[PDB]
Amino acid sequence: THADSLNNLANIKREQGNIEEAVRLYRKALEVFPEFAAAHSNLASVLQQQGKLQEALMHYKEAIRISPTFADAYSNMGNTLKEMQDVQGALQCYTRAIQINPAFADAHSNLASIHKDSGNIPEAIASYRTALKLKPDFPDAYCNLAHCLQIVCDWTDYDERMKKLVSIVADQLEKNRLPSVHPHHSMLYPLSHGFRKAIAERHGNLCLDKINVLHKPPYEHPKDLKLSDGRLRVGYVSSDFGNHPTSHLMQSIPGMHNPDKFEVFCYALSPDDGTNFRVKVMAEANHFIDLSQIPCNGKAADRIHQDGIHILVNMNGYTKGARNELFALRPAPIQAMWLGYPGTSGALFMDYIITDQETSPAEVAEQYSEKLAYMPHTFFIGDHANMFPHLKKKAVIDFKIYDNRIVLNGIDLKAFLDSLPDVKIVKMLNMPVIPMNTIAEAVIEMINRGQIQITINGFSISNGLATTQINNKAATGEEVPRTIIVTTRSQYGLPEDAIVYCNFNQLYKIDPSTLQMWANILKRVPNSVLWLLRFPAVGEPNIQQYAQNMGLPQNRIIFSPVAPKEEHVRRGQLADVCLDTPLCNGHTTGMDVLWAGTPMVTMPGETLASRVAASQLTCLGCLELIAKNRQEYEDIAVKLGTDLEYLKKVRGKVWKQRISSPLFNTKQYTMELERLYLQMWEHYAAGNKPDHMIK
Amino acid sequence: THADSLNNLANIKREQGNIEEAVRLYRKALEVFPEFAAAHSNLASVLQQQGKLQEALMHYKEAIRISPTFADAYSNMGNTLKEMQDVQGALQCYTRAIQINPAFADAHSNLASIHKDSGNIPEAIASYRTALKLKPDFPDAYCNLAHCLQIVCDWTDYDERMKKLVSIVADQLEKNRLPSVHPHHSMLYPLSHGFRKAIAERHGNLCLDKINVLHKPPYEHPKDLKLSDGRLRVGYVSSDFGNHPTSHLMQSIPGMHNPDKFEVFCYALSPDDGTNFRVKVMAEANHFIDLSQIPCNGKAADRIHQDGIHILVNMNGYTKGARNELFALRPAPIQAMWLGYPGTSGALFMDYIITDQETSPAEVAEQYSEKLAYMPHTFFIGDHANMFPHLKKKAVIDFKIYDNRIVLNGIDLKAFLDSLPDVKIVKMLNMPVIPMNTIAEAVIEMINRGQIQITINGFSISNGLATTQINNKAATGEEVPRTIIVTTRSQYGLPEDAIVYCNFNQLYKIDPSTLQMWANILKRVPNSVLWLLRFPAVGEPNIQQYAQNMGLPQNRIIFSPVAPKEEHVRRGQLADVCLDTPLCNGHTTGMDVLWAGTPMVTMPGETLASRVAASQLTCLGCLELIAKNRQEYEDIAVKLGTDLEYLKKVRGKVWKQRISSPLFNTKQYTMELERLYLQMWEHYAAGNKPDHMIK
């Protein structure tokens, strides 16, 4: 009975916020009565919340032994194992919880999250539906199921589903509970900007709550650049320094910073993955700090502060591997959101969001908690000029002139063409054309036979579908290919006599309105196909069914598997036009398609995520590809697929402008970022709180 | 139509064995008609069988695009991805195959194998049952389901299940088809020795078939030791040089070889896992070769032959990471099976099996294809004296004398005891006893509160349940613990006033007859419990149900979670007696329990796997623990649990003999292995084919 009262006191002190006094009291309850399942389970939950996972695990093991019918302890132990990256262990725990209590809705939902995170969406959907059958009012399961359904393009009762998600978010925000819709997913649903910002703010508040327990005082920040010899100390914080889209966009930036005025510190949140992306950033940053070896957020923020960082850059936001607790501790006087997260942090600890006038017009400042800090063209950047220089030029094979039926690319392409007798130069730079002779026959024979490579006049001619077999580092974009590569419509089953509209994003970005817009375009352009990716393959039958319901036969939509990085960018040259997703645009994917010289049609919305593609196109200098409404989006796409002279003009404009415009110019981008940094600094140094940097 | 005939010719040449002519003909069929789904699918299967997985994947991608209803191509592509270690990709493919054809039994079975290999046995069982519902006559699914059922101790219609497995194996052997029962699992079922050997032989034949395509001539072998300066070149081939039971048994052996007469080459089949086990073998072998970097079996066997190996040692047999194709190529004149595989290879390319008279009596030579090569005591060895020297001595705390209620172990235990005032020495070496005073109270308080560690007289006193939090390398056995560790019955919920019978093996080793024997023992010894492991936890409710059906209440069986290596060995000191599994004995597990000084009761069978424990006990010098039949096994176990003076005598015998006997003496073992090697060599050098080395 004394142990019961001690457990009650610990629970009181826990609610107050005194976690250390709660721990001491739970231990005293165990000292009095060691076989106390509830005290062990409560102490374990408290330790789990403190991030003391191994210690929490000891107490969960005690609870499960003492009470073998304690399904709740198995489920909670499963949650601790999942956080410890023991996926098999977590699954075993949720499995046992469901066996002990088949009516335990939470355990089914937690099991569904393992299937979801392991990529098994149909099993995740089945387990979430069981959870909701058992507990109809279950916001976590409903919202997680809605995201599974979004991933596979299951649009059954879509409008009602969207209304219920908004209703769930509204109730959770009103009742001061953490919303079940993740902030990174909030742009996919028709939530208000106010709701999307409030969800983000609640996630930011979790970070503040986790750091307030460290009882750390506010840091003394530098007030000048004297101790740094007139240099601005910029700290880039990312879990994505390695093989990840973030590095594929910005890996050249640290090394392009001016050492006379800037000192670059890269804070890695992930261990070294052995890739060239990680090698490059480690070799080129002035300082590289592996924070994955410092799990304590207090010690890691102390490390950042010790380095004397003036501007700390958040490249994660609410994405995998984030440690926003570092930013919540405020180790730097200026903290800015940049590139990795397409939305507001909603957090008071973030001062700025690096964006642009096209992506984030001054009118929509209300959607963001941060002050707007404008880059002059687009905040978007890509490392395509460095990673894929073999795609700067191309040659074609005339198999009957088409620029996207049979394509050649390579560092040594000019030398190869010079070894050939009857090459024609079509003025656009310029496009060399190889005629349908002996050399052209040998190339098509290789593709048809599935041969990996051939030799022509001593030159290495590679099948574009076999890059992983030739050079795996070139396939991933870690190395520039050293052979001449052949890319053809026949490699993907694309028609030689029709217009190819493409979209290479994950299928979750498509919604019913978007597929209807695309169906309207296809119906208006008889000789046309829509080229999509099995991203995931389980979404393919759903898209095909909705397309069939819209009146499109199976042959109007062509699916390809997701390809290695280099092949994905290179095969974009086969399309005529890219049809961008208005719900959430292609971001890295938009840069990929434009590097191939493919015009992209977009309809910018209101959210940051729905406006990126129009910002990329504005920078490129292709205003005619930006639609104000659905009818204009269809009209632009149909004009491109039917007015062939106009298509030629636009493809030529994209081909030239990816070089002449600032879009892929990493040096210019770094210099403009530096100008923006100095503006932020001079504003703070003069004793001012953050304000919009919009000129 | 010409493409149809070309595909038919390729199929003919494929059946003949001419794989290269088949490839050339499939490519010619594709040259004529590129959109040929069947030719792509056949070429992909051919390439997959050749081990050309990336190339096979290109052709499967073609087949699936051309024929979207080709469920067979999705399933086969899934098999290629599984072999490539792309588990998520494989699952996606099997998922698509089942969506395309819900009646496709093979795809359900392949999906069940992913759930099985990922540890999700209930989902594996559900998918195998769907496969068998769809196709009742399905040997692969039936046998794989039988193994899932064995893992979880599901004994529904067990006798009929065992009869069906034997019937399936009999039919497959008769019809010259690869048996569906894996040779590594064959000892778990009541198959004849002839059938178990024939299953093994069929697996050995797969290796020969895979190497015959390389068209490699027989290697010229050394006929003397002149080129090796009178030294015998011994090559240890293993995928387990790292954190694995194999290294926990033999890691000290390479470094203990006599360099004047032996030259040791360790051929690793696995990449470096970063553990101290891999460090030790790399540092101590005369040569360490990483064959994981040489995927071609032809090039890897050429490497072994180039090194001039006289005796090549197979430490895998039919276990994970094996490359038995290396042995099928015969790069060495003498090839021996050793330690890792508890059965016959059934293969003509293996000359010897290193065993002993107890494990493999001369009478049962017929069970093995290899000639018997006897070690003088047991072929079994363990690295316990090197890995766990802190368990060589122990002290107890008298909480009321018991040797297994509250135990202390540590390198500095003597110094700690010397700092204490009233320590009593109980003559057995000897056992120090600490009385129930201030120091004894502080220890129990730590355990009850779940505290990680305390300090007594400047000595570090660690909670045995918290080793991963104190020193993770000490928890895994990579380092010797540097603190004094406390192990108690209260840490595991074991009764302070009863006999503890234990079994720490994976639950698959238990069968109905074994659990009945154990129930008979428990019923005869009122003050007793059976201590088992959640190995896996999903087996716990099945064991508890069968025990309840046998008339044992829930409280007679205590389950603990699987523990880190050091904790598992150390906690064995808490038991009174180990009850060994007669179906398949504890092998590494038997060595673990004996190092704790725990008497193990065994009933040796006929298979190698069912006789290891009696061989370990014979070496130890505990003949009285070996039962001739079930009644004697129960009688021995009951005598140990009721005649307390006899129990004391036997526990004392085990405690002393683990040191004085040859059991854990790695130096003596290496020297005896060397004597055996020279016998094998002198026999071959004299121009003789292998014969039994039994004296």
Binding site: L178, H184, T476, V562, H587 | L81
Partner: peptide, 14 residues
């Protein structure tokens, strides 16, 4: 990609 990996931007656990 099938037979390898295609890293993507994804949500952190909550």
């Amino acid at each position: 990609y099938p037979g390898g990996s295609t890293p993507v931007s994804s949500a952190n656990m909550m």
